[PDB]
Amino acid sequence: SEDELYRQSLEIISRYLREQATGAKDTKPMGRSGATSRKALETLRRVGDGVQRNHETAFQGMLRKLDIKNEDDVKSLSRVMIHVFSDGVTNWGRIVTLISFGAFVAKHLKTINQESCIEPLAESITDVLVRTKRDWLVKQRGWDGFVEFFH
Numbered sequence: 001s002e003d004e005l006y007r008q009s010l011e012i013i014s015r016y017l018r019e020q021a022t023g024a025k026d027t028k029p030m031g032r033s034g035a036t037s038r039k040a041l042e043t044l045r046r047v048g049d050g051v052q053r054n055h056e057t058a059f060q061g062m063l064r065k066l067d068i069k070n071e072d073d074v075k076s077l078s079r080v081m082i083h084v085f086s087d088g089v090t091n092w093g094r095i096v097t098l099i100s101f102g103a104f105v106a107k108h109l110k111t112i113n114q115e116s117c118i119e120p121l122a123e124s125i126t127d128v129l130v131r132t133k134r135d136w137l138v139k140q141r142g143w144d145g146f147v148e149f150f151h
């Protein structure tokens, strides 16, 4: 508890991944900073959908390599995301790439009837994001900066 950046990040990443996998928009209400989370989510729908479409084949090739079939395969993904994601280059571009690839994997977990792994995948992406990029994100004003960068 007492970590708004983490809680907001999970709300937004979790909601994007569920709605990308199922095509249904979450109606359950947003917590503190609702206005910023809704706008964050709206921006992911536009920018994250763009990355998935623009780079479908790069995304498909990686999903094919990672050979995700189950809960264990999702747990191995975290360490891959750390190696690729935490390497000293931080920008909203690569952050959207991370979250877009997550939604792409989430869609695949729906298609293979492994939708019980989507909430853990979201947690693992959130943990990689906030654990490894905390000071950059606070400098960029967190999700308010995200929305302002892409509006």
Ligand SMILES: CCc1sc2ncnc(O[C@H](Cc3ccccc3)C(=O)O)c2c1-c1cc(N2CCN(C)CC2)c(O)c(Cl)c1C
Residues within 6 Å of the ligand: 055, 058, 059, 062, 080, 081, 084, 085, 094, 095, 097, 098, 101
């Ligand atoms: C777990 C998969 C993930 S998490 C994540 N998070 C942020 N950015 C990523 O990648 C972009 C490039 C990028 C790739 C595809 C589309 C847009 C940008 C980047 O690192 O700066 C990735 C990738 C990622 C990384 C790669 N690589 C890995 C090895 N490097 C040397 C070459 C690019 C890749 O081919 C693909 Cl398809 C992805 C999805």
